[PDB]
Amino acid sequence: LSLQIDAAKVEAQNQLNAARIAEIFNNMDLSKQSEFREFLKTVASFQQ
Amino acid sequence: LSLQIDAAKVEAQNQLNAARIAEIFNNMDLSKQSEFREFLKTVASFQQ
């Protein structure tokens, strides 16, 4: 029963680990793409 | 029953690993190609 408890706690910890890591990438992308879209307007102002 | 949970622990880790692999691959690639657009237009300003 100790082996069943240990495996269940680690398995639940893997789900909580993935939730913390996966939330970063998707949200960072929306900020990064908007940062380079804003940079287009800055560079093109000096280009003309 | 102990080893059945151990197998499900590794299985749960596999499904969550593959999910975070796909997210970070698309987000990093699209941001990297966007940074090249800024670099291209900046160099074009220096030439002229």
Side-chain angles (χ1 to χ4, degrees), chain B:
Chain B
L1 184 57
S2 299
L3 272 49
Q4 185 177 0
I5 303 173
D6 296 350
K9 175 174 61 180
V10 181
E11 190 176 0
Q13 179 58 52
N14 294 349
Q15 294 173 5
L16 295 166
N17 185 52
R20 286 172 288 181
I21 279 172
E23 289 175 2
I24 196 181
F25 180 66
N26 297 129
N27 298 149
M28 186 181 292
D29 193 59
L30 291 167
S31 293
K32 180 170 56 56
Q33 295 297 306
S34 290
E35 288 170 1
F36 194 75
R37 308 178 303 182
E38 318 313 310
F39 176 70
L40 185 60
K41 294 170 64 176
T42 294
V43 169
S45 302
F46 298 153
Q47 290 178 67
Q48 60 185 342

Side-chain angles (χ1 to χ4, degrees), chain A residues 22-38:
Chain A
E23 191 175 7
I24 303 173
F25 308 137
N26 302 124
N27 293 354
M28 186 181 287
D29 190 56
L30 303 172
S31 299
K32 286 288 179 63
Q33 291 179 352
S34 295
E35 182 175 0
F36 306 129
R37 280 180 292 201
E38 180 56 59

